[PDB]
């Protein structure tokens, strides 16, 4: 559920 955004969004955290 913190696994749906791999790809660029992950970058924001």
């Amino acid at each position: 559920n913190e696994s749906l955004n791999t790809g660029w969004l992950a970058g924001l955290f």
Partner: antibody, heavy 122, light 113 residues
Framework: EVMLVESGGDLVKPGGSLKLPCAAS????????MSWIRQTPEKRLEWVATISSGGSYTYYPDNVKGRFTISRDIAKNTLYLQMSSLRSEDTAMYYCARHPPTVVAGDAMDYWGQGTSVTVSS | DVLMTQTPLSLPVSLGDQASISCRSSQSLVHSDGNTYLEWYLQKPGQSPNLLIY???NRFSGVPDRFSGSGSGTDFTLKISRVEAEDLGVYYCFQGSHVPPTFGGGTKLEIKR
């Protein structure tokens, strides 16, 4: 269908404060990554804040960092934007947006609300 | 912050024609994972923007046909073949690669008549 309705916009004095809500219908907030994005009177779109699909992480670009807070209330199925210490440069339309899984739309934003309008002025 | 420079802010184009909006980035938007997080949005008058293309060359659900994302590295092209009344609005390019994510200034699609 999927619908996001921002509210809370208003005129406030510089250095003031206010909270935007954004109410989701059509999907659960607790299962999506969500951002606030603003559009200035001159149509320039700039990033405001983001919350992780699982709700444990937050981002703010440097110009709003430390003054703004994005929160979500999974029970209310509503996204918030607490805005403090406001500057006239913050005057813009505040859109509320969701990001589907990276498998669906390469972390892009599929739905955007209709905006609430904020004016920082004395 | 990566400058997203786009804006011929118009192109004049008659219905049923080609249309090519360009977008140039400050630097290469190729992610450390060999992706291109370049996106295209259309804002129709009095509306929020709508997603058209994500990841450089990927058309979103329901997003027509005549919409196509081409480009690489620093230069990008959204390309509308045909051109319908419904395509009117402002197109933005968008960069997710570099850490303050940035928009273009938008190109308005002007309809000839």
């Amino acid at each position: 269908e999927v619908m996001l309705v921002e509210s809370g916009g208003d005129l406030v004095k510089p250095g003031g404060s206010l909270k935007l809500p954004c109410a989701a219908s059509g999907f659960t907030v607790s299962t999506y990554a969500m951002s606030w994005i603003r559009q200035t009177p001159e149509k320039r779109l700039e990033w405001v804040a983001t919350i992780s699909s699982g709700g444990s992480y937050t981002y703010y670009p440097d110009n709003v960092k430390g003054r703004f807070t994005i929160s979500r209330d999974i029970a209310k199925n509503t996204l918030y934007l607490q805005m403090s210490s406001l500057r006239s440069e913050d005057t813009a339309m505040y859109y509320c947006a969701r990001h589907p899984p990276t498998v669906v739309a390469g972390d892009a934003m599929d739905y955007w609300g209709q905006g609430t309008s904020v004016t920082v002025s004395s | 912050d990566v400058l997203m420079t786009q804006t011929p802010l118009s192109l004049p184009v008659s219905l049923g024609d080609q249309a090519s909006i360009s977008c140039r980035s400050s630097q290469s938007l190729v992610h450390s994972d060999g992706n291109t997080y370049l996106e295209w949005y259309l804002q129709k008058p009095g509306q929020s923007p709508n997603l058209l293309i994500y990841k450089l060359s990927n058309r979103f659900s329901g997003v027509p046909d005549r919409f196509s994302g081409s480009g690489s590295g620093t230069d990008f092209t959204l390309k509308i073949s045909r051109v319908e009344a419904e395509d009117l609005g402002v197109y933005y390019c968008f960069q997710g690669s570099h850490v303050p994510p940035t928009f273009g200034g938008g190109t308005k699609l002007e309809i000839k008549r």
